[PDB]
Symmetry: C3
Subunit: 331 residues, 3 copies
């Protein structure tokens, strides 16, 4: 079976970097086509109660700031097995258990630049998608409690350039209208800035959906990282979102911020990031949505990594504002 996600977002961006040549480059209007075609299926093996499942999901066809074309298997592409009793284990390229919650709901109205990859910490906080991964998903115990857990190979280790590895776990309990989320992910042997890093990261979160139309999510992310030369670094962040949903409309407010980074006890001045964003959404069909959105990004003023050389952060390109309309269709 084929399954598309059609996704077009028209987005004009107003950059303020302090260089007007750079400002005109990064700023201006673009089309962020995140449409993707994928294939997936199951087959009942004649000699195996676990149901064989597989999926190949292609990439974004024409993202903004990027070229055209995407191969197959750039997004969640995997084989795995599933039994009703013990859930489903997948091998391949998946989302780590912590990353799922940083994406949804914690990056929801365009906050990702800050809560997703917007970091000041060294090493490697957590992982987007890693293509050398085993991941077990628990069933819904009592249809209320669920465990997600995974281990995998690192970014460099998946190309025979290193021995990066990582593991992570998260759990979700659905208390009536509530849902509580916690998550951990640790990376080892992260080669960066001329040192080898170990990153430990923990996430706490909550979610509610109430008949009056209010929905919300709030999350605390605690990011520690220890370098092999004995340096310590610590940063933490939050993301929350308030939304009212009436009829075929949803109004949404999101705020995310990393706070100042502490290195070796000493705090680094003005290294925090903050994003505010607002979003209207129309439920134009059971299968698709139209939406408008605007956001405000204030980024850090810089950070040197443990190699006398500057470290890259989501803010290394400068502050910017952004207004956008988009459509997204599911089939």
């Amino acid at each position: 079976e084929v399954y598309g996600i059609i996704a077009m977002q028209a987005a004009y961006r107003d950059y303020d970097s302090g260089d007007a040549k750079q400002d005109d480059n990064l700023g201006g209007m673009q089309l962020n086509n995140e449409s993707r075609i994928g294939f997936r299926g199951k087959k009942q093996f004649a000699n195996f109660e676990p149901t064989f499942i597989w999926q190949i999901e292609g990439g974004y066809v024409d993202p903004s700031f990027g070229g055209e074309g995407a191969g197959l298997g750039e997004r969640d592409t995997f084989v795995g097995f599933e039994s009703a009793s013990w859930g489903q284990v997948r091998l391949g390229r998946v989302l780590t258990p912590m990353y799922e919650l940083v994406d949804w709901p914690a990056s929801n109205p365009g906050l990702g630049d800050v809560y997703d990859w917007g970091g000041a910490i060294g090493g490697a906080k957590y992982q987007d998608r890693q293509s050398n991964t085993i991941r077990w998903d628990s069933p819904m115990y009592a249809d209320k409690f669920s465990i997600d857990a995974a281990v995998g190979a690192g970014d460099k280790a998946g190309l025979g350039a290193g021995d990066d590895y990582w593991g992570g776990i998260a759990a979700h309990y659905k208390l009536g209208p509530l849902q509580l989320d916690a998550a951990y992910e640790g990376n080892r042997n992260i080669e960066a800035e001329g040192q080898t890093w170990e990153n430990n990261t923990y996430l706490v979160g909550v979610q509610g959906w109430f008949e009056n139309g209010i929905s919300f999510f709030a999350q605390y992310k605690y990011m520690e990282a220890d370098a092999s030369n004995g340096v310590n670094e610590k940063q933490d962040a939050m993301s929350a979102g308030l939304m009212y949903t009436t009829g075929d409309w949803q109004y949404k407010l999101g705020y995310a911020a990393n706070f100042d980074l502490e290195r070796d006890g000493k705090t680094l001045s003005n290294t925090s990031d903050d994003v505010v964003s607002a979003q209207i959404m129309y439920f134009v069909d059971p299968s698709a949505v139209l939406y408008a959105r605007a956001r405000m990004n204030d980024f850090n003023e810089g950070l040197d990594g443990l190699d006398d050389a500057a470290r890259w952060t989501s803010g290394t390109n400068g502050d910017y504002n952004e207004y956008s309309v988009g459509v997204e269709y599911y089939f």
Copy 2:
């Protein structure tokens, strides 16, 4: 819906460059797989009168002179809307309105090296299908008249490397068997040769299809460009094609030519290009065609760009001939 165009052309090329190694390198027999798979569909959003449309079309899987594999969304990939009333707007990656007339009536059979990208002029004449584009296509007004119009971001601006942009318009009037086609396209902020260019291009053409089987097309293309240091360049070109169709056959003769280029009024000697080409075609099935064709390309002798360094044109590889057979199947 899945929709292929299966397309193979076996094409031997006899190059005359003035270096027999390059002639042996560039020449010889090759296989030009231009097949492509795409996915496309429409959807009537339950809460919206315009019908939603989308398409993701992959690239040439193994072109000649190139490697294998092409992602999805390398060709016409877009989302958009249509109502009978006001026509059809699509956003994403499309063909500019002038390029449609450069490609369809005017670049086949093999005239492309000359009429398509083969210009000798500086700056950036027009666009061969650019992403970051919105394009509105009108209805057939009075069942005689149709207008195509679109604007979009430049090549560099689509990666945050500049601020080039462009707009273009074309119209089509149908007098009996004839059709008159006119089109304009202008590009701005084109960063090239160390200067910034503004290129305006104007196209007039006609096409006819007659009950006796005689058909033809003829087109005049006018190309302007203004560099930021005050330099001006002007070059013009033509492409015409004649075809007789009897039974299951179409015979075709094609001629296209870029003419001599003027810089600051002074014309630069030997910068013209012209191609001659013949093509026999058999309609092996309603869904496919077989064709044999031979063409002969004579190219320009060189010109420096406005940075003392030679500029690249379709003739920078030297003159060449080419004989070819091919198949084309549509599903």
Copy 3:
């Protein structure tokens, strides 16, 4: 038509190279997703007795040691015709007639590092999958005898950088439970190491499958190579595999070896490669298998090419073992 081949292998590799960082990078566990999706079809042209056939096959979605994503048309992508009379001609990118016998049955389980792309011979022993190729596949005459024959442009010539080319032929006669296999493939205008080479390669082999559950294959590969400065090189190799089948199980044991390389009559010390492997395979569904395997590679100790600079072989990364389970599913 769409057709998957879903294929995942979890494979731990233990390298011994003589530098333990290289051992740590290259070694370790990885996920080798060799899943691939393709499209193929046939069409009876209304004015043409040969049946039109076509296929577009994507690449490996996430191989081990490599990144994600593969375009469409990285594997067998072709157009062609088939008649009951004369068999089947295909144009495009296919497997050469010799490489088919080097892959099946002679390279699995895990013998490819030595028998497939493994080698010490200069120039280019053979071609594995080649674009710009026409290949005629004969029928099974008398339901026992068939010819495979193909010629095409070289690797470098398909990008307009040279004129290397090649042809090849193989035959298979089926004497009862055995099948006798012979094959040749010759390459010309192969530029390497500052010389131009002509590569000749010959393969003879046998295959048997018995109701007793015993099945086997053995193959001898003869590779000669002659350089433009008058050097001669010769290397030869062998691969065999013995397997027993009980119920839904297949036991398999494999061995392959390239022998020491001869250059200009004088043999070059410690240039042989040998790999041995054992594998259990379960037939979990008519269309799928589970399998475990372990293998041992001892590779050569180095060889300077005809330019005083080392030549690359499958052993330029060092000896290693590998233990792995995997899955394999069809369409």
